[PDB]
Structure 1
Amino acid sequence: QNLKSTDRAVQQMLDKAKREGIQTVWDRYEAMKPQCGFGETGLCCRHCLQGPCRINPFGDEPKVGICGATAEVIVARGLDRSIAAGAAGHSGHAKHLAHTLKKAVQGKAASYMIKDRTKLHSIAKRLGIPTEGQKDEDIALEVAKAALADFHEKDTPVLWVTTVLPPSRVKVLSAHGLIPAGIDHEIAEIMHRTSMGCDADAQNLLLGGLRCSLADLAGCYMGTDLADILFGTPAPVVTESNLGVLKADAVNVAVHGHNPVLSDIIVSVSKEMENEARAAGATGINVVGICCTGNEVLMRHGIPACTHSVSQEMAMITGALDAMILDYQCIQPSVATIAECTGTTVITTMEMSKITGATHVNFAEEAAVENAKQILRLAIDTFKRRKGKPVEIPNIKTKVVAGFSTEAIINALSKLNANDPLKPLIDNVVNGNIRGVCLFAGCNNVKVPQDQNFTTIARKLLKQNVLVVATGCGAGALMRHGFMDPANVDELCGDGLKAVLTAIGEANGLGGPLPPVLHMGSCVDNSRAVALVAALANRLGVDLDRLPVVASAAESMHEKAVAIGTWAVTIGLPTHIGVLPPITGSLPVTQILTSSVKDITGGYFIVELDPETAADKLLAAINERRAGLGLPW
């Protein structure tokens, strides 16, 4: 089970699933081998009914699509659609939050409100929305209207791109025509241009893809902005992670998905429901997190993270998961089937994300508390049905210090320099105590022993004094292996990095360092890392492609992660991907994405499936940036 997951709690549940005959994601993967090499390489096209077309990577015919589409066209078109799908997910999430804020300040959903008034005003100012003499509800209405306006063409480009990157970076992108005109506009233009008999030039196709990835970035940043306004900006929190956060004697309720519009409500209402749970024989309601919705309520409320990504079925295999409350994205639909064996009540809540066999609750912001109570009462009913039964919760968990929003990081740094908070960070980059910054983002992927790439790469970078930040299930992987426990700083961090983490932590009164890795939140909260990197670029007076900052999607799977990797490249970062993307079927496409895009945006992809090698390549990229700034390395 060690070849499936490096997580010991997951291994224990895989043994339980095996002896109970419950098929897992790893079993379904084994049943799929060998996988199709045309698809793996990207040399397959089904964009019209003359297809499917395939191209042999090497050898004899077929060498070209039926319509004449070349390998480079087919590969670039498929990649573009993946970027568009990723953009559609992040921006649907943001769109939902924009409508929630609008309803809240028009008096249509009293369960929602402006919780972070300071963030509201800063966003409005960044957007050019006047605040002086205005009511908060009017400013927020204007912010929500501006958010919804960025989805379509208008007098301005997408402001959640042009107002969040430095002017020098926006100029570079505008010169190549890469600034999105509208978020859903770009998604649709990708689907048009990649349909049959349309765009058939790999360079033109990929430039369209870069622009669509900036539409995804805008969705991410808008999602983070709006959730912070509605639910509060994260500040440092201490909690726990892994399956041992389930409690046999409590009603265990997992929030799972990405959009916390309901799950933030679930957290608040579950406290109100405690006595009702106690009357049922439980100690209380134990809300735990799965995937990015779990990250959202971990960041803001300290809700412990149960598990992530590829191993999400294992939470149910314990026998103690009374309910799993789903919104959308990255939910394995197997959970609906597994629930018949484990007793878990799986509940969908969003109209456009239903799973055959799961109970659906039609959540509406107008009825959010009432929906939450209906959902939690199903969970309490489920706990009663297992009162007495034996469960197997692995007694395995880690300590997690998290909640490092960019505002929180700036505040923490401000204890070392009040009026120039970025300077202590840059000082230590310059003097070598901090070699560079690496963002770990993205998913787990069944092809990769779970967490192996994230932890192998992270260990090597931390020893070389790289400041490591993490989001999504990359944060999940590192959190479950102790990388967010400050007690592991001595073991994990090089001397220079340790000195910096200790100095900042002691100055924030902690008596100990910051954790080895800074948890910056959910997948949309990759936008927080952009905010930090852009602030560093502005403070240094350089563009992002001169900073010693890299990204690693070390184990990625979702189309959303393809979009994020592409916009990391587009804003200027060396961007590692640790699984094979479907580009190896076209050498020209691969050369554009890993080499010649350097000449356009300054960023580039680093495809490397071996984690030790990937870490060396990421260190080389960081050290090249150091050399270009004239620094020692």
Structure 2
Amino acid sequence: QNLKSTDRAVQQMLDKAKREGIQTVWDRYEAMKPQCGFGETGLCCRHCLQGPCRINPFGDEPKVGICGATAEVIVARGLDRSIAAGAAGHSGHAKHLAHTLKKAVQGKAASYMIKDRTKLHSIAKRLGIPTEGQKDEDIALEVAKAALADFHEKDTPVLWVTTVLPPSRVKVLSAHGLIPAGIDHEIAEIMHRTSMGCDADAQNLLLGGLRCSLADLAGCYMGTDLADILFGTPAPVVTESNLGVLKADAVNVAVHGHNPVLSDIIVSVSKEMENEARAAGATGINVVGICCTGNEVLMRHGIPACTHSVSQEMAMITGALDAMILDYQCIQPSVATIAECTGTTVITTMEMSKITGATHVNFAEEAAVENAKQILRLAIDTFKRRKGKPVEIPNIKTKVVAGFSTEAIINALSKLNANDPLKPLIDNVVNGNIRGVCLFAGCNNVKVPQDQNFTTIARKLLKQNVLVVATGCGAGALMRHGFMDPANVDELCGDGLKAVLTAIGEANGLGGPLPPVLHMGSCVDNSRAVALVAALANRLGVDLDRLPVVASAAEAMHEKAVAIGTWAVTIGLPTHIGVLPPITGSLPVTQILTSSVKDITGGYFIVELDPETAADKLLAAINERRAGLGLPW
């Protein structure tokens, strides 16, 4: 099973699924092989009813689409639609939060409130919304209105791009026409320009894609901002991860999907319902996280992470998962079928994301606590039904220190330099104790043995003194393999990095180091890494494409990960992707995305499926950036 996942708890559950005859994602992948090479290379188009069109990567006809679309057009159009789809998910998430903040401060959703007033005011200030003399609710109404306004054209560009990157970067982007006019505007324009008989120039299409990726960045940054306002900015927390966080004698409830609007209320209403659960024979309600909504409540509340991404069905296979509470994105719809075998109650909550066979409980922010109670009573009923059934929870977990929002990182560094917190970090980049920074982001992918690329790359970079930060299921992968346990710093980190993590942790009174990898949150909280990197660029007076900072979507899957990778390139980062995106069928598109975009944004994709080679390539990119700053490497 280690060919499927490197996570030992997942391996144990794959053995249980196998002997119980429960089909998993890996089994459905095997059943799909060999996969279509036209689709794998990007040389397939179904954009009109004259299709499907495909183009042989090599050989004879077909060489061109029926309408005359070339390989480079077809590849670029498909990629652009992926970016637009990713942007549509993160900005649906962000819009959900904007509407929740608005309802809350309009007195329409009393379960929600301004928790982080300081962040509310800083965001207002960043957007140019006056705060002096204003009620918090009015400031928040104006921030929510500004959030919603960024979805459409108006007399300013998308402010969750132009106000979150340094002016020099905005200028570069504007010079190439890449600043988004409106988040949903760009999504629609991508769908328009990529429809039949429209844009048919690869560079033009890909410039549109870069712009739409910044609409995705805006949605991510907006979602982090709004979720921090509503639910609190993360600070360092200690918890655990992997399936051993499930407890046979508790009602185990996973929150799964993405939006803390749902997850965060499940967490505190579950505390309220402890005696109800104890009346049912349980010790209490054990909320555990799956996927980004699990990252959200891990970061803010220390809720333990059960699993992530590709292995999400395995939590159900334990037999102890009483409920899986879903909102949207990245939920394998297989879970509704597996629930029939495992007894888990799968509950959908959002009208635009239902799964046949799952129970749907409309969640309305206006009724959040009551809706959460209904949902949790289904979970308790389910717990009662498995009274006396054996379960198989692997007794496998790791310790996870997390909660490293950018604010938390700055605060930690401020213990070393109170009025110039970034300087101790930059000092150690300059003296070589920190070689550079790498952000691990994005998914697992069934094509890659789960977590192998993240851990292989992260080990090599940590030994080379790279400061590693992670989000989403990259953070999930690293947490489940111990990379967020400070007890593993000696093993994992180069001496320079160890010295820095120790100096920071000791100054923060830990009696020990920060963990080897800093968990910066969910995938929208990639925006926190942008905030940190933009702050470093501003502090250094250079653009982001001069910083020794890279990104790696080492096991990417979702359209959202494609969008994040593309905005990472657009804001100036060398960006590794560890799975093949459907671009190999066009050399001109590949050359743009891996080479000539350097002349446009300074960032570039590094496509590399072999993780040791990817680590080398990421180190070379970091070291090239070091050299260009005149630093030793």
| TM-score, structure 2 normalization | 1.00
Q: Deviations over 1:86-111 (max 9, x none)?
A: 00000000000000000000110100
Matches within 5 A, 1:358-507: 358-507=358-507
Q: Deviations over 1:147-173 (max 9, x none)?
A: 000000001000000000000000000
5+ long unaligned stretches in structure 1:
none
Query: How far is the alpha carbon of 1:196 from its aligned partner?
Result: 0.2
CA separation in 1, counterparts of 2:105 and 2:472? 30
Q: Deviations over 1:222-257 (max 9, x none)?
A: 000000000000000000000000000000000000
CA separation in 1, counterparts of 2:312 and 2:354? 18
Task: Report SS of the residue matched to 1:439.
Answer: strand
Q: Deviations over 1:478-522 (max 9, x none)?
A: 000000000000000000000000000000000000000000000
Query: How far is the alpha carbon of 1:272 from its aligned partner?
Result: 0.5
Query: How far is the alpha carbon of 1:596 from its aligned partner?
Result: 0.2
Query: How far is the alpha carbon of 1:74 from its aligned partner?
Result: 0.3
CA separation in 2, counterparts of 1:279 and 1:571? 54
Q: Deviations over 1:166-220 (max 9, x none)?
A: 0000000000000000000000000000000000000000000000000000000
CA separation in 1, counterparts of 2:369 and 2:2? 42
CA separation in 1, counterparts of 2:256 and 2:311? 13
5+ long unaligned stretches in structure 2:
none
CA separation in 2, counterparts of 1:10 and 1:271? 28
Query: How far is the alpha carbon of 1:583 from its aligned partner?
Result: 0.2
Query: How far is the alpha carbon of 1:280 from its aligned partner?
Result: 0.5
Q: Deviations over 1:420-460 (max 9, x none)?
A: 00000000000000000000000000000000000000000
CA separation in 1, counterparts of 2:401 and 2:484? 5
Task: Report SS of the residue matched to 2:90.
Answer: helix
Task: Report SS of the residue matched to 1:156.
Answer: coil
Task: Report SS of the residue matched to 2:433.
Answer: coil
Query: How far is the alpha carbon of 1:262 from its aligned partner?
Result: 1.3
Matches within 5 A, 1:246-395: 246-395=246-395
CA separation in 1, counterparts of 2:581 and 2:262? 34
Query: How far is the alpha carbon of 1:349 from its aligned partner?
Result: 0.1
Task: Quote the residue 2:585 is aligned against.
Answer: 585
Task: Quote the residue 2:25 is aligned against.
Answer: 25
CA separation in 1, counterparts of 2:137 and 2:609? 49
CA separation in 2, counterparts of 1:498 and 1:384? 48
Structure 1 position 208 matched with structure 2 position 208:
yes
Q: Deviations over 1:116-139 (max 9, x none)?
A: 000000000000000000000000
Q: Deviations over 1:572-593 (max 9, x none)?
A: 0000000000000000000000
Task: Report SS of the residue matched to 1:370.
Answer: helix
CA separation in 2, counterparts of 1:71 and 1:271? 56
CA separation in 2, counterparts of 1:12 and 1:305? 17
Task: Report SS of the residue matched to 1:58.
Answer: coil
| TM-score, structure 1 normalization | 1.00
Task: Report SS of the residue matched to 1:235.
Answer: coil
Q: Deviations over 1:376-412 (max 9, x none)?
A: 0000000000011100000000000000000000000
Task: Report SS of the residue matched to 1:624.
Answer: helix
Task: Report SS of the residue matched to 1:323.
Answer: strand
Task: Quote the residue 2:121 is aligned against.
Answer: 121
CA separation in 1, counterparts of 2:308 and 2:394? 15
RMSD: 0.3
Q: Deviations over 1:546-585 (max 9, x none)?
A: 0000000000000000000000000000000000000000
Task: Report SS of the residue matched to 1:168.
Answer: helix
Task: Quote the residue 1:3 is aligned against.
Answer: 3
CA separation in 2, counterparts of 1:162 and 1:365? 30
CA separation in 2, counterparts of 1:573 and 1:527? 14
CA separation in 1, counterparts of 2:214 and 2:2? 38
CA separation in 2, counterparts of 1:589 and 1:332? 31
Task: Report SS of the residue matched to 1:324.
Answer: strand
Q: Deviations over 1:9-50 (max 9, x none)?
A: 000000000000000000000000000000000000000000
CA separation in 2, counterparts of 1:144 and 1:502? 40
Task: Quote the residue 1:70 is aligned against.
Answer: 70
CA separation in 1, counterparts of 2:106 and 2:385? 42
CA separation in 2, counterparts of 1:260 and 1:532? 22
Query: How far is the alpha carbon of 1:263 from its aligned partner?
Result: 1.2
CA separation in 1, counterparts of 2:421 and 2:12? 45
CA separation in 1, counterparts of 2:523 and 2:616? 25
CA separation in 1, counterparts of 2:136 and 2:246? 40
CA separation in 2, counterparts of 1:74 and 1:271? 52
Task: Quote the residue 1:176 is aligned against.
Answer: 176
CA separation in 2, counterparts of 1:269 and 1:599? 52
CA separation in 1, counterparts of 2:562 and 2:4? 23
Matches within 5 A, 1:548-627: 548-627=548-627
Query: How far is the alpha carbon of 1:260 from its aligned partner?
Result: 1.2
CA separation in 2, counterparts of 1:453 and 1:601? 26
CA separation in 1, counterparts of 2:452 and 2:384? 38
Task: Report SS of the residue matched to 2:260.
Answer: coil
CA separation in 1, counterparts of 2:372 and 2:59? 59
Q: Deviations over 1:270-323 (max 9, x none)?
A: 010000000000000000000000000000000000000000000000000000
